[PDB]
Amino acid sequence: AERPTLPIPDLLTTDARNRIQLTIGAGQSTFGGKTATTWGYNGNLLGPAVKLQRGKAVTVDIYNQLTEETTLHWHGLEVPGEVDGGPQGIIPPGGKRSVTLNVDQPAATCWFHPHQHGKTGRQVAMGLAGLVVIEDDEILKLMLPKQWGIDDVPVIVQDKKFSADGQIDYQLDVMTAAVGWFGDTLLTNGAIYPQHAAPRGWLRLRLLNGCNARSLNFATSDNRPLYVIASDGGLLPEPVKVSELPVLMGERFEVLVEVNDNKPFDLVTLPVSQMGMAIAPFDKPHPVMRIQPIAISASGALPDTLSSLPALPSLEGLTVRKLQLSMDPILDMMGMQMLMEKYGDQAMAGMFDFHHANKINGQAFDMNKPMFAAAKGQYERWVISGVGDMMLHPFHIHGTQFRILSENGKPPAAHRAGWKDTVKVEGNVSEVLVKFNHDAPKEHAYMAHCHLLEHEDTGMMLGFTVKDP
């Protein structure tokens, strides 16, 4: 009858021993009345919100209760490579690995997910993702909405496709290696079109695009504005009012939205210009969740000023690193053909071993050979080109929060000008200003890769190390 309520990830903080336990395991979820095998952190699906504090360290004990290897990448955390959880962070099935997270970065919503070599897309599709809520001394002074699960709410948005038996229907084949794995069912914290009761006043949504390959574009059903207050790596200097908010795979934004009177409204996602992603029902605005106003306590506010953003340093004398993304023309031809044959023209609306056909600087990912050594504690200019390549590539660099200088041909939109760990590359060139505060040796290198997961799984990744020059 009624919509399910929005599931709220548990806020998970350290214990008296300053430890946090994460169990990775297989269970069961229900989607549209049909049960499915799913994977989760501390549960059947998705995961908790690990809560960290700047200036404090926590030890996370990770128990892998799957029957296959996995890793745990702390997406957005400025931590050394040894705990970064790239493909070299193997956790054996039935085994346990512990990492120390010594947090030293501004308040932010980050997240965590597998980075198993060649299998990251499958493991995310099966259910593995969690959140990270970093707080500091600055953000709690602001009196933003702060009641977790009431007026401060995480919103993890993901698509899946299921086979007739109800099971998740994941495949890494020549089509998905080209355009990505995408589905026809939209999930919001694991539920289909849930409702969230929100007190009158301001509602804070921590948005995460957790799709393998689908880009999203958030808006409200009645075109009330969203006020962006934070990006991947934390607060903007001041709120940025937008009518729609595109969000790439793996990106987070925090928005405030007004909840007035008592009329419900929807958070929705608007059709995107991305290949494969405008097939019905995604050819039209698609609801994400229903917001239901209520009359309980809430004192959160939208501040005029949020934080201070340092100036972009001088580009003069900085090391420039060039990263050329590419796809084997045969993969582009064959994958495109299969997409068009199956879905037809709508797959372009609004516009052979494939396992190593996606590449950076002419090379599919080689775990034994980091491509370069970056300087610790020094700004570098990284130039990432998708010239000659049709596809969307949200490009993620581990171990940093960087500043976008140029995004795919233009300066970043204001709400994208702050701290980011992902930058858009699509048929043009992006430039980012990056600094690495922590070491990563050859045996636990940082990754830089496309976050369209099927591209990463088929080669579009490089490792790099960081050491004091």
Residue numbers in the entry: 29 to 379, 402 to 519
What's the publication's text?
CueO plays an important role in copper homeostasis by oxidation of toxic cuprous ions to cupric ions. As with all multi-copper oxidases, it contains four copper atoms distributed within one type 1 (T1)2 copper site and a trinuclear cluster comprising the T2 and T3 copper sites. A distinguishing feature of CueO is a partially structured 45-amino acid segment (residues 356–404) capping the entrance to the T1/sCu copper-binding sites. The goal of the current study was to engineer the highly compliant MRS such that CueO activity would be modulated by engagement of a partner protein with a scaffolded peptide.
Having delineated the MRS subregion suitable for introduction of peptide sequences, we produced two additional constructs (CueO-PMI and CueO-PM2) using previously identified higher-affinity MDM2 binding peptides. The affinity of these variants for recombinant MDM2 (residues 6–125 comprising the p53 binding domain) was first measured by fluorescence polarization. Both variants showed high affinity to MDM2 (apparent Kd 28 ± 1 and 25 ± 1.5 nm, respectively), comparable with affinities of their unmodified linear and stapled versions. Whereas the activities of CueO and CueO-HA were similar, CueO-PM2 showed ∼2-fold reduced activity, indicating auto-inhibition by the PM2 peptide that is relieved upon MDM2 interaction. The reduced activity of CueO-PM2 compared with CueO and CueO-HA along with its impaired Cu binding suggests that in the absence of MDM2, the PM2 helix reorients itself to block access to the sCu and T1 binding sites, most likely by packing adjacent to the CueO α5 helix. However, in the highly similar structures of CueO-PM2 and CueO-12.1 (Cα RMSD = 0.22 Å), the MRS-PM2/12.1 regions were not resolved. The rest of the CueO-PM2 structure showed high similarity to both the MDM2-bound form (Cα RMSD = 0.3 Å) and native CueO (Cα RMSD = 0.37 Å). As the PM2-containing MRS retains some intrinsic disorder, a transient conformation likely inhibits CueO function, with all or a subset of the Phe, Trp, and Leu residues in PM2 contributing significantly. The reduced T1 copper occupancy observed in CueO-PM2 likely accounts for its reduced kcat, with this phenotype contingent on either all or a subset of the Phe/Trp/Leu residues in the PM2 insert. In agreement, CueO-PM2 meets this criterion (kcat CueO-PM2/kcat CueO = 0.32), and MDM2 binding results in increased activity.
